[PDB]
Amino acid sequence: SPCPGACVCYNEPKVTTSCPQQGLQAVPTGIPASSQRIFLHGNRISHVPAASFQSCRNLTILWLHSNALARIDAAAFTGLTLLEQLDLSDNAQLHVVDPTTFHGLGHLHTLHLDRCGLRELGPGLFRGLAALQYLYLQDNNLQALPDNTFRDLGNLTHLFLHGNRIPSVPEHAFRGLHSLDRLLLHQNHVARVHPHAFRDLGRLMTLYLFANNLSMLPAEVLMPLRSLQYLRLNDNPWVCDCRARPLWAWLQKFRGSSSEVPCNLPQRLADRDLKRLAASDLEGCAVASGPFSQLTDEELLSLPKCCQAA
């Protein structure tokens, strides 16, 4: 089959059908089945039917970023067993992706879902993608991080989740990520992290948690991070008292580079780095919940265990 209109087809280095920066409001008909690389970025494609791309059995790279995508059929990528790169980024209209869209893509190693406005990550959305190494989910509308979302992503090295409305980190949210190298979770709403949440992140070297809503960090949370060399806890409402003691001992016994850990409370130790603080500064308590040692024994029950010291 000859090359379709408003397109350029060539064979070197791979059989490529290139139709970018056109006025195409949909996928052009007549794309050669021999295509290994398809470039349809910079257009105005609204929908991606299931019939399209099926002919291209040998398709390895597919670019559909910077379009007007709003609805992708669940069987659109059926038959593309050799698909390696899939870029669907910069599609703010694409608010939701059907959980069975990526089934069968066992060769996919890079996936772009950034700047799409994804509200949620559907159950089984990343099931069976055991070859995925780069997953871009940054700058979406994600406001939840469900357990076992990346359970099958054992080869994943880069996971970008920054720029979302993610409120907390459940225990099994990052389970299965044994080969994770960099984890970017900055500019979210993270205020709570489970003690055994980084259970499998032993090979993690980079962890970005800055610009969040964290007030404290448990004792067992940073324990499994044996390979961590870069850590950033900038821009967080840290509370510097007895509850910050397990974090302080960790920051002290840490060789890798880490950003500043600015205190927010109490005002006495405000703006100072928890790193440089001494063991004496980490006693008593600071104001939490209702603003105010005139608290009753019942009232201090709503305070940390160390904070309840007599």
Ligand SMILES: *[C@@H]1O[C@H](CO)[C@@H](O[C@@H]2O[C@H](CO)[C@@H](O[C@@H]3O[C@H](CO[C@H]4O[C@H](CO[C@H]5O[C@H](CO)[C@@H](O)[C@H](O)[C@@H]5O)[C@@H](O)[C@H](O[C@H]5O[C@H](CO)[C@@H](O)[C@H](O)[C@@H]5O)[C@@H]4O)[C@@H](O)[C@H](O)[C@@H]3O)[C@H](O)[C@H]2NC(C)=O)[C@H](O)[C@H]1NC(C)=O
């Ligand atoms: C990152 O992703 C990796 C994949 O991208 C993943 O690697 C996968 O690991 C899993 C382990 O859970 C493997 O699953 C296993 O698959 C094998 C398949 O058989 C394998 O070994 C046979 C050996 O055959 C022998 O006998 C034949 C005679 O028939 C001889 O010729 C041969 O020389 C041997 O003596 C081999 O033939 C298989 O080859 C496959 O691929 C060729 C194409 O190259 C096909 O033509 C062939 O038919 C066959 O399908 C294959 O190597 C299975 O038997 C086990 O039970 C188990 O299910 C995956 O295969 C493996 N995928 C790879 C390597 O691509 C990594 O695990 C992942 N990383 C992390 C951390 O999760």
Ligand SMILES: *[C@@H]1O[C@H](CO)[C@@H](O[C@@H]2O[C@H](CO)[C@@H](O[C@@H]3O[C@H](CO)[C@@H](O)[C@H](O[C@H]4O[C@H](CO)[C@@H](O)[C@H](O)[C@@H]4O)[C@@H]3O)[C@H](O)[C@H]2NC(C)=O)[C@H](O)[C@H]1NC(C)=O
């Ligand atoms: C995806 O990739 C696979 C694997 O690379 C590929 O299967 C292969 O297709 C090519 C070409 O279609 C095959 O090579 C040809 O073999 C046929 C017979 O098998 C020959 O007829 C060809 O020789 C000439 O004849 C043609 C006209 O009769 C000429 O037009 C042509 O230019 C040649 O001069 C040619 O050598 C190859 O045998 C298979 N199999 C393998 C294992 O490579 C498949 O086609 C690709 N595309 C899709 C959609 O699957």
Ligand SMILES: *[C@@H]1O[C@H](CO)[C@@H](O[C@@H]2O[C@H](CO)[C@@H](O)[C@H](O)[C@H]2NC(C)=O)[C@H](O)[C@H]1NC(C)=O
């Ligand atoms: C950061 O987290 C705090 C909770 O620690 C959020 O504020 C709380 O809001 C609830 C009501 O939903 C109150 O009961 C709490 O007393 C509030 N706590 C504090 C410390 O204000 C706050 O909204 C979060 N901020 C962001 C930007 O997500």
Ligand SMILES: [Cl-]
């Ligand atoms: Cl990449």
Ligand SMILES: [Cl-]
């Ligand atoms: Cl506590």
